[PDB]
Amino acid sequence: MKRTWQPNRRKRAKTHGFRARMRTPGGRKVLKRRRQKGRWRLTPAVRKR
Amino acid sequence: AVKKFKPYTPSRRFMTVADFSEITKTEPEKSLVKPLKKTGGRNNQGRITVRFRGGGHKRLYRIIDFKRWDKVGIPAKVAAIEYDPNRSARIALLHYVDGEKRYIIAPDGLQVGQQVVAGPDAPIQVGNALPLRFIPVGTVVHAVELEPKKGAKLARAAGTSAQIQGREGDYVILRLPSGELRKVHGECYATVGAVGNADHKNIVLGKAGRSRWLGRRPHVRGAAMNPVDHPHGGGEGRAPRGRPPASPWGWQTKGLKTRKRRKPSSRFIIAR
RNA sequence: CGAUGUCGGCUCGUCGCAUCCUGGGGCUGAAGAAGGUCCCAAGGGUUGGGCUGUUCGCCCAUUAAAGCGGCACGCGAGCUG
RNA sequence: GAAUGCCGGCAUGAGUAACGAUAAAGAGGGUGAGAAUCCCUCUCGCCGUAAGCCCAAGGGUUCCUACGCAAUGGUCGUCAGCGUAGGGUUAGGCGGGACCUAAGGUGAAGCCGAAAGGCGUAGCCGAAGGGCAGCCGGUUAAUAUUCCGGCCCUUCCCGCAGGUGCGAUGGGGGGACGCUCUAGGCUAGGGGGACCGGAGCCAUGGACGAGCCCGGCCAGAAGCGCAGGGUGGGAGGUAGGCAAAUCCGCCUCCCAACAAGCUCUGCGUGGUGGGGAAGCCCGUACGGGUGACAACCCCCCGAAGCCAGGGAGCCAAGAAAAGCCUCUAAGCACAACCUGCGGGAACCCGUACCGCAAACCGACACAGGUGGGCGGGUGCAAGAGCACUCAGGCGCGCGGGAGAACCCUCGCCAAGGAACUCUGCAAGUUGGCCCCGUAACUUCGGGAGAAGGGGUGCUCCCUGGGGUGAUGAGCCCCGGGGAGCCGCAGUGAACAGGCUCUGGCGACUGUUUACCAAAAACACAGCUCUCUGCGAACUCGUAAGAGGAGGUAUAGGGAGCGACGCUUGCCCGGUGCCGGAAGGUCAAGGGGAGGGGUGCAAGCCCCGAACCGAAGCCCCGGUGAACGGCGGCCGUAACUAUAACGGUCCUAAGGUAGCGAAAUUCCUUGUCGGGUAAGUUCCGACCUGCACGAAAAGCGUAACGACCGGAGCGCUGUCUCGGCGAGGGACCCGGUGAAAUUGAACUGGCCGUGAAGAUGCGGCCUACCCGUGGCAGGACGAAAAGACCCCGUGGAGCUUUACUGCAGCC
RNA sequence: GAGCUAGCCCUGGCCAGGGUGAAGCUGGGGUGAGACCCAGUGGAGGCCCGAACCGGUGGGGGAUGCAAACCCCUCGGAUGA
RNA sequence: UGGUUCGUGGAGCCAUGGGGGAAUCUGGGCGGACCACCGCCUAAGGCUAAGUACUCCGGGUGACCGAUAGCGCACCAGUAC
RNA sequence: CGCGGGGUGGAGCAGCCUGGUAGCUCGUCGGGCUCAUAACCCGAAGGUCGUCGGUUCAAAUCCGGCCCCCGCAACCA
RNA sequence: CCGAGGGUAGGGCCCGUGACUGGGGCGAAGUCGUAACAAGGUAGCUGUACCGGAAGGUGCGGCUGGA
RNA sequence: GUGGGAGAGGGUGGUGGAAUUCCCGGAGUAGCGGUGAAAUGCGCAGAUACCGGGAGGAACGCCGAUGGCGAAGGCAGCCACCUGGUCCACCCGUGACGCUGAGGCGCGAAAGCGUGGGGAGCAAACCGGAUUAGAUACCCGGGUAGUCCACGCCCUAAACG
Ligand SMILES: [Mg+2]
Ligand SMILES: [Mg+2]
Ligand SMILES: [Mg+2]
Ligand SMILES: [Mg+2]
Ligand SMILES: [Mg+2]
Ligand SMILES: [Mg+2]
Ligand SMILES: [Mg+2]
Ligand SMILES: [Mg+2]
Ligand SMILES: [Mg+2]
Ligand SMILES: [Mg+2]
Ligand SMILES: [Mg+2]
Ligand SMILES: [Mg+2]
Ligand SMILES: [Mg+2]
Ligand SMILES: [Mg+2]
Ligand SMILES: [Mg+2]
Ligand SMILES: [Mg+2]
Ligand SMILES: [Mg+2]
Ligand SMILES: [Mg+2]
Ligand SMILES: [Mg+2]
Ligand SMILES: [Mg+2]
Ligand SMILES: [Mg+2]
Ligand SMILES: [Mg+2]
Ligand SMILES: [Mg+2]
Ligand SMILES: [Mg+2]
Ligand SMILES: [Mg+2]
Ligand SMILES: [Mg+2]
Ligand SMILES: [Mg+2]
Ligand SMILES: [Mg+2]
Ligand SMILES: [Mg+2]
Ligand SMILES: [Mg+2]
Ligand SMILES: [Mg+2]
Ligand SMILES: [Mg+2]
Ligand SMILES: [Mg+2]
Ligand SMILES: [Mg+2]
Ligand SMILES: [Mg+2]
Ligand SMILES: [Mg+2]
Ligand SMILES: [Mg+2]
Ligand SMILES: [Mg+2]
Ligand SMILES: [Mg+2]
Ligand SMILES: [Mg+2]
Ligand SMILES: [Mg+2]
Ligand SMILES: [Mg+2]
Ligand SMILES: [Mg+2]
Ligand SMILES: [Mg+2]
Ligand SMILES: [Mg+2]
Ligand SMILES: [Mg+2]
Ligand SMILES: [Mg+2]
Ligand SMILES: [Mg+2]
Ligand SMILES: [Mg+2]
Ligand SMILES: [Mg+2]
Ligand SMILES: [Mg+2]
Ligand SMILES: [Mg+2]
Ligand SMILES: [Mg+2]
Ligand SMILES: [Mg+2]
Ligand SMILES: [Mg+2]
Ligand SMILES: [Mg+2]
Ligand SMILES: [Mg+2]
Ligand SMILES: [Mg+2]
Ligand SMILES: [Mg+2]
Ligand SMILES: [Mg+2]
Ligand SMILES: [Mg+2]
Ligand SMILES: [Mg+2]
Ligand SMILES: [Mg+2]
Ligand SMILES: [Mg+2]
Ligand SMILES: [Mg+2]
Ligand SMILES: [Mg+2]
Ligand SMILES: [Mg+2]
Ligand SMILES: [Mg+2]
Ligand SMILES: [Mg+2]
Ligand SMILES: [Mg+2]
Ligand SMILES: [Mg+2]
Ligand SMILES: [Mg+2]
Ligand SMILES: [Mg+2]
Ligand SMILES: [Mg+2]
Ligand SMILES: [Mg+2]
Ligand SMILES: [Mg+2]
Ligand SMILES: [Mg+2]
Ligand SMILES: [Mg+2]
Ligand SMILES: [Mg+2]
Ligand SMILES: [Mg+2]
Ligand SMILES: [Mg+2]
Ligand SMILES: [Mg+2]
Ligand SMILES: [Mg+2]
Ligand SMILES: [Mg+2]
Ligand SMILES: [Mg+2]
Ligand SMILES: [Mg+2]
Ligand SMILES: [Mg+2]
Ligand SMILES: [Mg+2]
Ligand SMILES: [Mg+2]
Ligand SMILES: [Mg+2]
Ligand SMILES: [Mg+2]
Ligand SMILES: [Mg+2]
Ligand SMILES: [Mg+2]
Ligand SMILES: [Mg+2]
Ligand SMILES: [Mg+2]
Ligand SMILES: [Mg+2]
Ligand SMILES: [Mg+2]
Ligand SMILES: [Mg+2]
Ligand SMILES: [Mg+2]
Ligand SMILES: [Mg+2]
Ligand SMILES: [Mg+2]
Ligand SMILES: [Mg+2]
Ligand SMILES: [Mg+2]
Ligand SMILES: [Mg+2]
Numbered sequence A: 001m002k003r004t005w006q007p008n009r010r011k012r013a014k015t016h017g018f019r020a021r022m023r024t025p026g027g028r029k030v031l032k033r034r035r036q037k038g039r040w041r042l043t044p045a046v047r048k049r
Numbered sequence B: 001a002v003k004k005f006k007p008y009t010p011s012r013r014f015m016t017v018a019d020f021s022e023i024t025k026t027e028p029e030k031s032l033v034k035p036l037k038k039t040g041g042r043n044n045q046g047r048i049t050v051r052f053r054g055g056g057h058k059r060l061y062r063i064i065d066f067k068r069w070d071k072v073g074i075p076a077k078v079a080a081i082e083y084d085p086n087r088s089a090r091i092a093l094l095h096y097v098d099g100e101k102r103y104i105i106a107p108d109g110l111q112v113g114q115q116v117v118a119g120p121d122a123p124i125q126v127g128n129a130l131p132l133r134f135i136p137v138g139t140v141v142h143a144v145e146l147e148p149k150k151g152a153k154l155a156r157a158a159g160t161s162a163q164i165q166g167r168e169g170d171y172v173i174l175r176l177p178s179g180e181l182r183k184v185h186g187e188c189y190a191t192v193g194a195v196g197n198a199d200h201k202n203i204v205l206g207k208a209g210r211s212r213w214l215g216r217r218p219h220v221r222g223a224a225m226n227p228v229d230h231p232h233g234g235g236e237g238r239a240p241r242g243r244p245p246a247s248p249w250g251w252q253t254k255g256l257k258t259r260k261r262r263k264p265s266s267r268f269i270i271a272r
Numbered sequence C: 001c002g003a004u005g006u007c008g009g010c011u012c013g014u015c016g017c018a019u020c021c022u023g024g025g026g027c028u029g030a031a032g033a034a035g036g037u038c039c040c041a042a043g044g045g046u047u048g049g050g051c052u053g054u055u056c057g058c059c060c061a062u063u064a065a066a067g068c069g070g071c072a073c074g075c076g077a078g079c080u081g
Numbered sequence D: 001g002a003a004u005g006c007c008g009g010c011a012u013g014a015g016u017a018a019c020g021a022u023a024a025a026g027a028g029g030g031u032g033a034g035a036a037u038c039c040c041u042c043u044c045g046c047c048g049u050a051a052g053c054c055c056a057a058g059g060g061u062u063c064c065u066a067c068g069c070a071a072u073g074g075u076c077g078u079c080a081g082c083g084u085a086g087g088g089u090u091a092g093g094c095g096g097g098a099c100c101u102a103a104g105g106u107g108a109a110g111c112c113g114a115a116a117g118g119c120g121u122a123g124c125c126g127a128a129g130g131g132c133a134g135c136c137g138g139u140u141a142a143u144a145u146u147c148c149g150g151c152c153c154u155u156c157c158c159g160c161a162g163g164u165g166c167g168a169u170g171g172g173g174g175g176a177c178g179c180u181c182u183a184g185g186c187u188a189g190g191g192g193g194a195c196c197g198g199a200g201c202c203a204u205g206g207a208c209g210a211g212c213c214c215g216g217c218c219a220g221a222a223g224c225g226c227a228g229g230g231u232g233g234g235a236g237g238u239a240g241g242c243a244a245a246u247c248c249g250c251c252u253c254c255c256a257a258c259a260a261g262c263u264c265u266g267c268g269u270g271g272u273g274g275g276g277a278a279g280c281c282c283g284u285a286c287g288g289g290u291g292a293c294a295a296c297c298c299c300c301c302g303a304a305g306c307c308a309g310g311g312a313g314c315c316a317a318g319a320a321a322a323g324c325c326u327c328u329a330a331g332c333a334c335a336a337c338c339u340g341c342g343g344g345a346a347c348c349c350g351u352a353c354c355g356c357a358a359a360c361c362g363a364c365a366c367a368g369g370u371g372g373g374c375g376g377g378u379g380c381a382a383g384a385g386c387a388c389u390c391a392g393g394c395g396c397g398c399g400g401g402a403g404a405a406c407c408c409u410c411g412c413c414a415a416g417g418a419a420c421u422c423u424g425c426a427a428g429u430u431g432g433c434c435c436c437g438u439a440a441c442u443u444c445g446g447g448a449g450a451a452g453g454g455g456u457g458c459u460c461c462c463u464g465g466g467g468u469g470a471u472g473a474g475c476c477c478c479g480g481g482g483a484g485c486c487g488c489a490g491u492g493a494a495c496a497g498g499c500u501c502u503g504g505c506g507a508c509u510g511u512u513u514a515c516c517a518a519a520a521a522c523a524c525a526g527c528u529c530u531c532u533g534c535g536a537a538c539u540c541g542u543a544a545g546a547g548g549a550g551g552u553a554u555a556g557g558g559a560g561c562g563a564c565g566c567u568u569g570c571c572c573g574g575u576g577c578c579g580g581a582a583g584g585u586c587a588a589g590g591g592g593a594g595g596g597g598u599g600c601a602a603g604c605c606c607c608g609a610a611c612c613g614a615a616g617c618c619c620c621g622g623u624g625a626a627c628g629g630c631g632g633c634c635g636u637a638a639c640u641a642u643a644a645c646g647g648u649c650c651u652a653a654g655g656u657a658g659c660g661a662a663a664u665u666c667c668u669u670g671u672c673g674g675g676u677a678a679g680u681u682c683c684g685a686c687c688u689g690c691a692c693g694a695a696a697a698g699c700g701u702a703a704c705g706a707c708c709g710g711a712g713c714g715c716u717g718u719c720u721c722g723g724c725g726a727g728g729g730a731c732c733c734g735g736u737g738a739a740a741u742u743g744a745a746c747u748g749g750c751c752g753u754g755a756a757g758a759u760g761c762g763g764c765c766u767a768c769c770c771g772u773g774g775c776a777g778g779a780c781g782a783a784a785a786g787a788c789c790c791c792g793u794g795g796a797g798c799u800u801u802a803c804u805g806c807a808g809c810c
Numbered sequence E: 001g002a003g004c005u006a007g008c009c010c011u012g013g014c015c016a017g018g019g020u021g022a023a024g025c026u027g028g029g030g031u032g033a034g035a036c037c038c039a040g041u042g043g044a045g046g047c048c049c050g051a052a053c054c055g056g057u058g059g060g061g062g063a064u065g066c067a068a069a070c071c072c073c074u075c076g077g078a079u080g081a
Numbered sequence F: 001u002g003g004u005u006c007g008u009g010g011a012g013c014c015a016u017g018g019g020g021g022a023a024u025c026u027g028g029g030c031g032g033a034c035c036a037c038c039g040c041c042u043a044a045g046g047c048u049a050a051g052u053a054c055u056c057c058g059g060g061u062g063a064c065c066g067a068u069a070g071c072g073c074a075c076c077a078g079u080a081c
Numbered sequence G: 001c002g003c004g005g006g007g008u009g010g011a012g013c014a015g016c017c018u019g020g021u022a023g024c025u026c027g028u029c030g031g032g033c034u035c036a037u038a039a040c041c042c043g044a045a046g047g048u049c050g051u052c053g054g055u056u057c058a059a060a061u062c063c064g065g066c067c068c069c070c071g072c073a074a075c076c077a
Numbered sequence H: 001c002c003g004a005g006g007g008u009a010g011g012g013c014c015c016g017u018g019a020c021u022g023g024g025g026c027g028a029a030g031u032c033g034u035a036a037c038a039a040g041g042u043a044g045c046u047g048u049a050c051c052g053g054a055a056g057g058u059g060c061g062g063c064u065g066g067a
Numbered sequence I: 001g002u003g004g005g006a007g008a009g010g011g012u013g014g015u016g017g018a019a020u021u022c023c024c025g026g027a028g029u030a031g032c033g034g035u036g037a038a039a040u041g042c043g044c045a046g047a048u049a050c051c052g053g054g055a056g057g058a059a060c061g062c063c064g065a066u067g068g069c070g071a072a073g074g075c076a077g078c079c080a081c082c083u084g085g086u087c088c089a090c091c092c093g094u095g096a097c098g099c100u101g102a103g104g105c106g107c108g109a110a111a112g113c114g115u116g117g118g119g120a121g122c123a124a125a126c127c128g129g130a131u132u133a134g135a136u137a138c139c140c141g142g143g144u145a146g147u148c149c150a151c152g153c154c155c156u157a158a159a160c161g
């Protein structure tokens, strides 16, 4: 059947990107938490040009 | 007149379509004056706030003239009468000698080629606009302003009118389509005649689809729902209500008057 | 009750006997034929259809007879639902 | 030592199940330490509106090559999408960005909000939509519309040359638009040819023949030619297009009424550039040479594509902005802009490869899902259908045998035809086309494919229309009549309704429990009530604000009923809602009669009665397509029987019509009648309606239903009642190799006993040790800390005239 | 968190081939003029048969599956809500 | 209405959102309703070290652990997945 | 089986809960109006209060046991 | 070839019969009421419409077969 | 044909006053309505009676007649428009062109039906209050269709002289 993962580079970027997270206090805290944690990747790596 | 069909299909046996014979050879509209992009959307910034809206034909807005006092004294020739997707009535395309082209909402009896004009001057004829004062008591009228210089707001639906009843210092009394008795300021413009397309009420949609074409989504009964959804939801195999009938939001829907009492508008109203 | 699947049907059965049939027998208000009733006897047999989910039962047409009950109302790690 | 404890390790089932589609394999030769599995050749089979080909998303080295096989591959592996390394992605014209705007997002102005923040006209961001200049070949092992070859373009910048008042983010025009049906001419694509080109070939009885087989094109500037799209030209007047305007708009006169003329596309042609089969020889994994100076011509079918803003009809009335044309304002007119020709300038990012899939989404080389374009040939009425087949791509990454039970899938049957079963569930009969011919009823459309019939191949003769062609031959579609031939059978294979009668419910097409319910449920047009005068009512939000709606009573919100026909009776006592400037009560406040506490007092400080005090409640009416409700007991007619009539008690009023053992009937298989040999169902009645009944609508209704019941016909393996055959497993051999379960085990029957159902206790009976295929009675077999039931002063969801608050409205 | 699913907004795309033959238009008839009736044309429709595509009706298989919704036969819709 | 031990209590003091609304030393607040007395302070403007908190970081010590412990990580771990 | 309502003149109903009196309509019987009947008018009659038991000074009335009558209930399996 | 007739299938008319049901008719002395005939005690009749145990009543309009 | 005459003949539009009912303002009390008699009902929440304004619908007093017109049904304030039938005179024109009339077609009171209006009065049904043995009637107080308009059906009658 159709499963739940339907990859889209634009969606992933607009949805979970560094700039989206930065836009709101909710998201800014996510970066803070991930930084303090020592996460190698703050936001998902969306590729291609 | 109303177009009628034979039952060559079920739902074609009741279906019924407007007569478009008053639609003069001018079916597609007029750029310049109108159209605008019209912005379909069944809801506010976010959430739906009027249920069951959506779908249905794309539209172009015809930006019509609801304040006729710009062109006081300037007459215009009625050039055409065309279909307007965004109202019950039809619209008149008129050419002002000025050059300017406006649309007026098209009254009953309006003929193409006719002369029409607005102002204190203005022969009392179908199509003309006047401040309510100079209009003879008892004449039927439409596109009436509520307060002066604020635009036509009463009687624009197809086949509607108001009748002038009497006067009272600065106000003339109106009898509105609903039957209400209203004091409306003398200085309010209103155009003589009834609205026309009066056979609009006689049309039978005929099937579900037609409803959808006009963007009317299926309306579901409270009875059909559940207690979470509606006061009428549940219980077992059908149910008669079990309380005084209500809206989904709990207010009673048979009888409960809802106009706020202390409206300052009150001292200008005399009926139902 | 940290699970003993619950009606009926189907399939496969097996057992009890307080025997429906057939075998033996006493009494009969048993002439004979056919019955009634009781005793001995389970070796084998104990039909096909209509309605009902039905068990049971009421019918239809037969038959030697169309027996009753136990087996977790026998049998769902065999089927049906 | 126990926690269905936690982590780790190793067992058991077990050499068991399986090895992922039943599209299919055989052989010969290579290479190698090692071949069913790799490379090659011959044969066989499968897809072919794909299982072929090209894009888009996603993927991100998987692409190419050399070297390798420990792991990854459901077996093997010399092979690989795997390991090591090295290569490989070339753009002014293809796509995206130095262009535009949509929803939406952002947001200077502004508004709002405890803070975080929320709205937000302008502007900006935002794309498969708009705009925009490259076509055909050739080369690499791997890239090419990117490199190269030919032919053809677009921008800027700088020149000269010639024109003109040039000139804005501003005015106007255009861009610019729906659905269905379509005309004319074109191309793509295809079929035919006795014509042209070509290696070759006479086979096995015949054929050296208009014999067989193969191929007969592609791009192409200007200029033409055929199609076809766009558009009227002047002169005045002007108050509108938010400054201006010669532009546009409007009024008035002339000339055209036409595509005549200008343009703008498409298509044919075109200077010239390229391609070019079979077969044969070769050594490649694969391609090369020759065939070739290849030929490159004529007919025919013909689009859904092009001309494209084509036309016709319809209602539901079908983006925006820029590019482009124009008009003028600031300004400038030694500027500038337009046109012609030259030279120069022309960046950034993507490009490999997979891509209906072993490279994407499903943990897997997963029988699943995944948007667009092409998708040939014959035959079948047509077609993207179906059977075979081009090109092209595969044989589905474990094999070999055997020929039991049993399972799955399939084929056939004597005789009977539903006796099967909850039920004809399943399977069968039917089946395409043409022609005859079709009932009740009906909303006059339908019912209708009703039902029931016949025809269907090949051959020869005569013969009617068109289409392309000149009015002709041919080529191509539709037809008619007449003789005859063959078989069991002519839509000879494949795709392709079984039919009727009669009830229930729902009118109808629709919709729904993604993953057990598709229905009689939801929706539906339509009907009625009800609120709403517009800063509407209602909804979201603390607000600002937005939806409603750029709508205005023929309109919008809420409720219910649910096409249509005939209809919807009585009760306002209670509850709701509606209407009532009286009255009663009623909080804060007003008011202070009177009293209290302190002071030597002036004073300061407390309570406090009349009386004035709102909505609300009470009170007075109305309102049932508002919440709802719509009786009991005795008697009576000149056969009995029954009760039109009556008495009496109560009510707010006492169930009308129309239905009725029903989706409603307990007693119940009610009671007659009909279908049957037989009928707890079904159908027609009766009415004693436990417990119908009129908008939670009443009784009907043509048509419609993968709904539900009853019946008959046809036909059958459903059954009497089975039998045989096929294939994939099962079984045996080689290869890989799981699982839940498991206190331990050396794990028999009976009759007892035991926590009351014993392999394990007692007695007796039986029984040598160990396996393999099978059947499931049992281990109260596995699986889930029972779903039901109860418990816990456990939890949630729901309701209301439970309590208490809150929003909201007054 | 709406890359599954639900609705709506913006912008594009898809639906082979067959049947049936509404209005309308034309001619004819009819009348004082009509309605109306015949043909012919015409190509309507939540119209019909049926691929794609979208569904998920009945039966069987699958049940440590190919698959945590599949497969086969059969079936509904297929210019529209 | 909040704060304080103070939950309306005899409920003050301190703070306030709403209404009313002064005085400048013979002026005002306070000492638990209120009043008298006797006393204490001097509102409606601001700044002010030190003693106090913490431990990402460096240093010392341990009747603290010793790779199922000790931080999740002694090991390229906030990694693989 | 459970629960709660009811048996009062011939008929249908009050009368109970706050014990002492049995009342209403109809019917019936006698008289009148009428030719006659009904209607109407004037008088009258009629009740072991379901039975058993006692509580009381005293029971239709209060409390028990039975007896018919009526309505409700009987759910989860 | 045709053809009596047989078979199949679907119709049209007619007759017989059918639980139950609608009204009709006739039947010496049954129940209920008083509609009409005298102004029949509400003048009657009427077409239609609704309502009612029954005759019937009422609404609308008409008639002289009444004043 | 020429020339005139009467008429509620028909259709459409417009308009006038009287009267009822409701609304508001005034003034004003203790009852009004209604019947054979009463009651229901309305009225101290301010009725009835009277005055002033407003709205709305329907019907047209006197003229009016025992009258006129029409083919019948039917037709009544006034105005204008559109239109039918009809009679008198003059004896001018055509010149037998005539009568009836199965069927057909058209009209057709009221009631009723469909769709949308409008709704003052009256008023089937229905609800009360009286009357009665009982009244689903006659009387009274309420009151929905309908009565009115438009269009479309219905085709009946003591459509009667
Ligand atoms: Mg525009
Ligand atoms: Mg919002
Ligand atoms: Mg938002
Ligand atoms: Mg609904
Ligand atoms: Mg529900
Ligand atoms: Mg609720
Ligand atoms: Mg129910
Ligand atoms: Mg409810
Ligand atoms: Mg248990
Ligand atoms: Mg257990
Ligand atoms: Mg014995
Ligand atoms: Mg004997
Ligand atoms: Mg059965
Ligand atoms: Mg049993
Ligand atoms: Mg037995
Ligand atoms: Mg038992
Ligand atoms: Mg059992
Ligand atoms: Mg078992
Ligand atoms: Mg079941
Ligand atoms: Mg222990
Ligand atoms: Mg373990
Ligand atoms: Mg095993
Ligand atoms: Mg085995
Ligand atoms: Mg095996
Ligand atoms: Mg790699
Ligand atoms: Mg190699
Ligand atoms: Mg391997
Ligand atoms: Mg490779
Ligand atoms: Mg590699
Ligand atoms: Mg740049
Ligand atoms: Mg941009
Ligand atoms: Mg925008
Ligand atoms: Mg924002
Ligand atoms: Mg932009
Ligand atoms: Mg773009
Ligand atoms: Mg481009
Ligand atoms: Mg390549
Ligand atoms: Mg411009
Ligand atoms: Mg522009
Ligand atoms: Mg030979
Ligand atoms: Mg060319
Ligand atoms: Mg200007
Ligand atoms: Mg070659
Ligand atoms: Mg066009
Ligand atoms: Mg712009
Ligand atoms: Mg210019
Ligand atoms: Mg590339
Ligand atoms: Mg490529
Ligand atoms: Mg594809
Ligand atoms: Mg594989
Ligand atoms: Mg694998
Ligand atoms: Mg796959
Ligand atoms: Mg697909
Ligand atoms: Mg094709
Ligand atoms: Mg073909
Ligand atoms: Mg075909
Ligand atoms: Mg195919
Ligand atoms: Mg395989
Ligand atoms: Mg057989
Ligand atoms: Mg046979
Ligand atoms: Mg048969
Ligand atoms: Mg049977
Ligand atoms: Mg049986
Ligand atoms: Mg059946
Ligand atoms: Mg079947
Ligand atoms: Mg049926
Ligand atoms: Mg049926
Ligand atoms: Mg349905
Ligand atoms: Mg679905
Ligand atoms: Mg489901
Ligand atoms: Mg279905
Ligand atoms: Mg309806
Ligand atoms: Mg708004
Ligand atoms: Mg709006
Ligand atoms: Mg409404
Ligand atoms: Mg409903
Ligand atoms: Mg319903
Ligand atoms: Mg009702
Ligand atoms: Mg009530
Ligand atoms: Mg009341
Ligand atoms: Mg009430
Ligand atoms: Mg009230
Ligand atoms: Mg009050
Ligand atoms: Mg019955
Ligand atoms: Mg019932
Ligand atoms: Mg029978
Ligand atoms: Mg029977
Ligand atoms: Mg019901
Ligand atoms: Mg109801
Ligand atoms: Mg219904
Ligand atoms: Mg359907
Ligand atoms: Mg049968
Ligand atoms: Mg079989
Ligand atoms: Mg086999
Ligand atoms: Mg093996
Ligand atoms: Mg042993
Ligand atoms: Mg035992
Ligand atoms: Mg032992
Ligand atoms: Mg033992
Ligand atoms: Mg076992
Ligand atoms: Mg087994
Ligand atoms: Mg078991
Ligand atoms: Mg178990
Ligand atoms: Mg438990």
Ligand SMILES: [Mg+2]
Pocket: D788, G076
């Ligand atoms: Mg339970």
Ligand SMILES: [Mg+2]
Pocket: D793
């Ligand atoms: Mg408790």
Ligand SMILES: [Mg+2]
Pocket: none
């Ligand atoms: Mg036609």
Ligand SMILES: [Mg+2]
Pocket: none
């Ligand atoms: Mg069509």
Ligand SMILES: [Mg+2]
Pocket: none
């Ligand atoms: Mg369809």
Ligand SMILES: [Mg+2]
Pocket: E050, E078
């Ligand atoms: Mg179909």
Ligand SMILES: [Mg+2]
Pocket: none
């Ligand atoms: Mg299903």
Ligand SMILES: [Mg+2]
Pocket: none
């Ligand atoms: Mg406090």
Ligand SMILES: [Mg+2]
Pocket: none
């Ligand atoms: Mg203070």
Ligand SMILES: [Mg+2]
Pocket: none
């Ligand atoms: Mg103080």
